[PDB]
Ligand binder design. Structure first.
Ligand SMILES: Nc1nc2c(ncn2[C@@H]2O[C@H](COP(=O)(O)OP(=O)(O)OP(=O)(O)O)[C@@H](O)[C@H]2O)c(=O)[nH]1
Ligand SMILES: Nc1nc2c(ncn2[C@@H]2O[C@H](COP(=O)(O)OP(=O)(O)O)[C@@H](O)[C@H]2O)c(=O)[nH]1
Ligand SMILES: Nc1nc2c(ncn2[C@@H]2O[C@H](COP(=O)(O)OP(=O)(O)O)[C@@H](O)[C@H]2O)c(=O)[nH]1
Ligand SMILES: [Mg+2]
Lengths: 430, 439, 53, 103, 430
């Protein structure tokens, strides 16, 4: 019941999805060698949310794995906990994207996306009552921006009722991994806004900033970064797997957070997070978690809220707690910082509670942010795009694969339109 | 032969429904196993379990309850909970998808695929009952499922049965300690559904309970278990008269004819006392003298509305324990002597009195210990206008420029409907202003 | 953050953070209590506080 | 230490001894002597049981005399209240049995 | 009927109060658990003067314990007989007056005093018909005086016809316990003399002398000191809660003991007193009882009783004993002390007979008289006051909370005038 699906594409998508599946297997009690070694009966009560059943009591995850380059499929399969995934879910080509959007949505994808749609349709229809889709992809890369988005349009057109989830790691001007990052990402925003109901961007440069400052670890690596995100989206779907005092589902989250259809962009975070130095010197109560939650540096996106004002924000607490403290703390933060919350909407904070926290901590908090600070993120990329496009640098690759500059100009116009329409409310007053 | 069918819908009701039954279970000696061994009593006693339980012919008792919700999450815990063997296996209606806190979803599209089972269950339930006195329904107004399915269910009953009186306990959003962001929308449209359809409404706002819990119970970290306990007491508080011997029994039918002067003015607020924990009780006296006096304390009211800001329109009280009735009159008389509490000009007699001997039962492990007396105060006053006003003020700001409207519009509900809500909600307010004027 | 660290060194030389790595140097071998608590609803309305006692 | 409770004290007081062996009564007790302290008997005297051959002799001396058979019966119920293995009875313990007795 | 409540403020009042309350109960057999265990009817005939009832049949005393710091109460209730008091009466501050008259009287005391007055007002009204209050405190405590006086002041301003009784300890300079005692001791006199209807002073120093000499105990403790005082209070009200040959309520004692309006300072003593070494020789008789009363070691005030003249005196004979020799002894006493008795007011001896003696003894006698001998104490305390003020040493604190040197000048001159006015009658002749 209320089961969902997961589609991960591109290298980043595969990495994040593998980490998330590892975390979920840990939480539920699934072993590589698949049999059940969980203890609490509560875990098996609703295990059907993210898993089917197969002959021999071996659980399989309803994931979809796809990409246009062979290594990514081969690498995740070789590593532990990649052996849970269904090989039949493996689909791929032998060409490669090479950081070319058109290579990812017009020429090659059309020939291979036919197979992928069939697998997703069959798997989805298999279950009883869907609840939505949560997709992991990247906008600054080649494969992820195009292949996933094309999948997005087709899936949304086919199934116009169920909501969708997306995890995008937008690039930032601090650390760059591609010299053409603005283009494929900028064109990505043009198509995604019309279909993707919920989007929760993720920024790498915040990862290093959060990794270096709060964690204080000397030498972090990719495993460290990927791990955090798995926590956030595992917590976003906590009440739907476990009982609680006030259950809150995906549809509940969107309804309380999106005022208008064009403003559906969020930023998230995770807590509690403690440096290795001071682990055991601090407690576990609503006060500390709520204080760390709203911190500027605790967020998971490059946007800094203090230059913007939140419209709607929801808190999905985990584990037992005293509710009155939950309510009292939320109001206190609301009242002491009226300048940061717009006025014409009263009670612009939501709450929720669940009875089971992650293994190894008394409680934890997952936070979703919808504030005007997301305007800056798009603005900087727009700045790069115009400079790169005026001289038409690197434009010949994309002009030579059926694309037209009309689409580029339309996308560039659209991004500015969304930026303006989203920054309007900051100065708009009742 | 005197029985009342209970209706519970929505997350808010379910747990409060959970609390009421357990105490109901305790008061009769029916252990969760489904039996009432008692002192080996088999036929050697009165038949008082009719009011809330029915005999199966040999052994167990089946509660007269129907449970409704669109998310199986809440039902599952009860179905596998500590009372798994009591409720009827199939009368626990379970849904498929959550109402997602949207009225349109809960009243026009998904709520129309489950009502058929609800009415079928109720119609059969009424068949067993012979002395149906009314209906008691617990629901939440700040939730799409709550207001939606509850409103539709109540409407269905209005025509199906009609003259049968209805008493409903709702839960409005707190004045400032509020969780949902779209709760006001569902509330107002919920008010329209129950405004002209329900008979007696008992405000049961949440924030008031917290202060009552914190200040008197002296608890700083209450949980949802504590608040549910208080509500079950009042629910058991109001109806306990019909099922136990009392000096002046009062039937649920004797509220519409004693507490609602006008057809549209039928919204009322509750309060409870005495409230004492299991630590500082035996050194205090608990006399009818002050127990009644405390009941009128504004800070002790069960709702966040100051009774000092409006005249009193009609009152009703019930006494329990070893209260000597003449003690009842003495407490009332001085209250009239006090000038702080004032009534309206057109109500000469505004105190309805009833005395039931039985002492309130104590569920071990709780907060309220065994006292020998208590009083339940249920009064309708013109002061409740403010709370409706405050919700209205919230609506105007968040509806001036279509806040979250498209979510409700797309489900099918017409845009002009909201204009209907504002008209009705404000119309009631303007109705209340005229009532308080002096002759 | 964005600026490099000039001194790398091995461990033992309390240069740079040194202390932070030590804190947790045992926590790698420090155990964590596993298992999942027994919910809230199942906590209050248990077999106790009923007609069985 | 403050109070010399481990020096064994002198069996004869020196009238000018400034140390305390712990046998002195604090003022809380002093203001309220145990009733019969004014005639040389302390209340821890009825809690020492005595034998019937002497218990009786105490009882004919007072003026309370009971015939054999009735004396033996009353004594036994005094012991029954005592519920003690030793045959000796608590003289006051016989003082409660009489009150309930005599009827 | 015509009962009283019992109220404590400051550190001293707390310690004395516990003793007295424990003193009263055992007399009637009120066990700590609150279940009656007395024997005689008289132990229950008039239990109303000091006790009420509630659900369960147990008894609670209408005493509202007050203190500005938590430490004392956390222990006092932690000690024996900490279970009789209603916790509802526990209201206390968090900072502590710091033995500063300024702090506990105008700045902090004013804020918290609202609660006690409400409870004090609540308690008084409940009675059928009230007579007066009794307050125990010491002028040597900054916290005690601050709250205590206002409670003394406001209450009287609220109830004019009741009988206000206070037993304060004036610190003689022999046993000094604090640097700022001279200041706070004097000021509290300014207000209390104006409003306090009756005053009965007791000296800690004189307490010691009686304990060391009469009791002949090697080492006394605070329990021994305050326990003595508890006896006197019981003899103060002893005539009020039992049948007696000459009943005399607190008001009646007021008539016979204050010939002139402002002369309202009293000193009392309790007899008999015997030593465990001397227990079993003395001859408890009216003959012996009287002789102890008029000795200088009978009276708990440092001022020498033969250093003036006695305005009036009374004694509430405790226990059963005919009066014939009592009156003849009284005239016997009066004639052979006539040279010390003021000449212009004949018949300055009062006698009252109460059949109920303190448990554990046969006869009991208490002394209450008004003598010119009290002049020295004010002089010794007043003299110390002048020295401090000349250099204004330690005056800065009081100025720091609103006090002004004008008020300090006003108080002393009022005190000094009192001494002169009191000794004014000392040389008066008919
Ligand atoms: N006092 C109290 N209020 C509750 C409780 N459960 C739900 N509520 C109320 O319900 C409101 C939010 O609605 P939900 O938590 O979504 O429950 P619902 O009304 O059934 O709505 P759905 O989740 O769609 O089923 C809150 O504002 C609460 O006032 C409860 O156990 N105690
Ligand atoms: N946070 C994080 N980002 C990654 C990781 N691996 C790759 N990326 C980001 O993904 C981008 C490359 O996208 P890419 O996989 O080449 O897209 P594709 O060519 O369509 O498959 C780079 O800019 C990286 O910033 C990772 O392990 N963690
Ligand atoms: N008899 C007696 N006197 C005391 C006791 N405690 C303090 N005092 C007197 O109180 C005076 C100082 O009072 P203080 O400590 O300032 O009172 P506080 O401010 O309420 O704590 C000293 O001179 C002592 O003689 C006690 O237990 N018994
Ligand atoms: Mg719900």
């Amino acid at each position: 019941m209320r089961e969902i699906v997961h589609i991960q594409g591109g290298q980043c998508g595969n990495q994040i999805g593998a980490k998330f599946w590892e975390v979920i297997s840990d939480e539920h009690g699934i072993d590589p060698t698949g049999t059940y070694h969980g203890d609490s009966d509560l875990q098996l009560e609703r295990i059907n949310v993210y898993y089917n059943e197969a002959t021999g009591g071996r659980y399989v995850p309803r994931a979809i794995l796809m990409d246009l380059e062979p290594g990514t499929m081969d690498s995740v399969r070789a590593g532990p906990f990649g052996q849970l995934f269904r090989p039949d879910n493996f689909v791929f080509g032998q060409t490669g994207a090479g950081n070319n959007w058109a290579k990812g949505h017009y020429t090659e994808g059309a020939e291979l996306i036919d197979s992928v749609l069939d697998v997703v349709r069959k798997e989805a229809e298999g279950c009883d009552c869907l609840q939505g889709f949560q997709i992991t992809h990247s906008l600054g890369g080649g494969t992820g921006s195009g292949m996933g988005t094309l999948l997005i349009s087709k899936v949304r057109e086919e199934y116009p009722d169920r909501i969708m989830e997306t995890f995008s790691v937008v690039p930032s001007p601090k650390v760059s991994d591609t010299v053409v990052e603005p283009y494929n990402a900028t064109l990505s925003v043009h198509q995604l806004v019309e279909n993707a109901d919920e989007c929760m961007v993720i920024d790498n440069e915040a990862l290093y900033d959060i990794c270096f400052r709060t964690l204080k670890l000397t030498t972090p690596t990719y495993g460290d970064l990927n791990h955090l995100v798995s926590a956030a989206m595992s917590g976003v779907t906590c009440c739907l797997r476990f009982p609680g005092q006030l259950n809150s589902d995906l549809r509940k989250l969107a309804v309380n957070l999106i005022p208008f259809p064009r403003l559906h962009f969020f930023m998230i975070g995770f807590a509690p997070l403690t440096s290795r130095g001071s682990q055991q010197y601090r407690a576990l109560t609503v006060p500390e978690l709520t204080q760390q939650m709203f911190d500027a540096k605790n967020m998971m996106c490059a946007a800094d809220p203090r230059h913007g004002r939140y419209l709607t924000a929801s808190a999905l607490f985990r584990g037992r707690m005293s509710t009155k403290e939950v309510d009292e703390q939320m109001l206190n933060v609301q009242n002491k910082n009226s300048s940061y919350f717009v006025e014409w909407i009263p009670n612009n904070i939501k709450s929720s509670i669940c009875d089971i926290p992650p293994k190894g901590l008394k409680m934890a908090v997952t936070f979703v942010g919808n504030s005007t600070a997301i305007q800056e993120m798009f603005k900087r990329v727009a700045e790069q795009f115009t400079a790169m496009f005026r001289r038409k640098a690197f434009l010949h690759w994309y002009t030579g694969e059926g694309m037209d500059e009309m689409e580029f100009t339309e996308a560039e116009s659209n991004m500015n339109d969304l930026v303006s329409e989203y920054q309007q409310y900051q100065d708009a007053t009742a | 032969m005197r029985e009342v069918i209970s209706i519970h819908v929505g997350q808010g009701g379910i747990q409060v429904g959970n609390a009421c039954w357990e105490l109901f279970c305790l008061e009769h000696g029916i252990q969760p196993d489904g039996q009432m061994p008692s002192d080996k009593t088999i036929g050697g006693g009165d038949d008082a379990f009719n009011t809330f339980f029915s005999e199966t012919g040999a052994g167990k008792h089946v509660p007269r309850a129907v449970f409704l919700d669109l998310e199986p999450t809440v039902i599952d815990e009860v179905r596998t909970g500590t009372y798994r063997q009591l409720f009827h296996p199939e009368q626990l209606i379970s849904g498929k998808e959550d109402a997602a806190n949207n009225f349109a979803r809960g009243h026009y599209t998904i709520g129309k695929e489950i009502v058929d089972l609800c009415l079928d269950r109720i119609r059969k339930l009424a068949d067993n009952c012979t002395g149906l006195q009314g209906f008691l329904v617990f629901n939440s107004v700040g939730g799409g499922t709550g207001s939606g399915l509850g409103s539709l269910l109540l409407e269905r009953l209005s025509v199906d049965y009609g003259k049968k009186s209805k008493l409903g306990f709702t839960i409005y959003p707190s004045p400032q300690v509020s969780t949902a962001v779209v709760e006001p929308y569902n509330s107002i449209l919920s008010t329209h559904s129950l405004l002209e359809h329900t008979d007696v409404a008992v405000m049961l706002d949440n924030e008031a309970i917290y202060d009552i819990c914190r200040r008197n119970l002296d608890i700083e970290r209450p949980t949802y278990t504590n608040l549910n306990r208080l509500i079950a007491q009042v629910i058991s508080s109001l109806t306990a008269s019909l099922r136990f011997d009392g000096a002046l029994n009062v039937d649920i039918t004797e509220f519409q004819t004693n507490l609602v002067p006008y057809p549209r003015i039928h919204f009322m607020l509750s309060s409870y006392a005495p409230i004492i924990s299991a630590e500082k009780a035996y050194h205090e006296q608990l006399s009818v003298a002050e127990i009644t006096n405390s009941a009128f304390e504004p800070a002790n009211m069960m709702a966040k509305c100051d009774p000092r800001h409006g005249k009193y329109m009609a009152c009703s009280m019930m006494y329990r324990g070893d209260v000597v009735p003449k003690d009842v009159n003495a407490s009332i008389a001085t209250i009239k002597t006090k000038r702080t509490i004032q009534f309206v000009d057109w109500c000469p007699t505004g105190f309805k009195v009833g005395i039931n001997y039985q002492p309130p039962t104590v569920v071990p492990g709780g907060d309220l210990a065994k006292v020998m007396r208590a009083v339940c105060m249920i009064s309708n006053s013109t002061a409740i206008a403010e709370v409706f006003s405050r919700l209205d003020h919230k609506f105007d700001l968040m509806y001036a420029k279509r806040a979250f409207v498209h979510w409700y519009v797309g489900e099918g509900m017409e845009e002009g409907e909201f204009s209907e809500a504002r008209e009705d909600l404000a119309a009631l307010e303007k109705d209340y202003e005229e009532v308080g004027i002096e002759t | 953050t964005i600026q490099d660290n000039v001194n790398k060194y091995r461990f033992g030389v309390l240069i740079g953070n040194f202390a932070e790595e030590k804190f947790g140097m045992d926590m790698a071998q420090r155990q964590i209590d596993e298992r999942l608590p027994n919910s809230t609803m199942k906590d209050s309305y248990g077999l106790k506080n009923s007609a069985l006692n | 230490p403050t109070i010399r409770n481990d020096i064994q004290k002198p069996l004869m007081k020196s009238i000018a001894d400034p140390n305390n062996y712990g046998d002195e009564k604090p003022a809380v007790n002093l203001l309220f002597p145990k009733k019969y302290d004014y005639m040389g008997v302390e209340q821890d005297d009825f809690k020492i049981k005595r034998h019937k051959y002497e218990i009786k002799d105490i009882f004919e001396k007072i003026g309370y005399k009971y015939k054999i058979g009735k004396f033996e019966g009353i004594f036994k119920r005094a012991q029954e209240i005592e519920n003690s293995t030793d045959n000796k009875v608590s003289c006051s313990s016989f003082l409660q049995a009489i009150q309930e007795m005599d009827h």
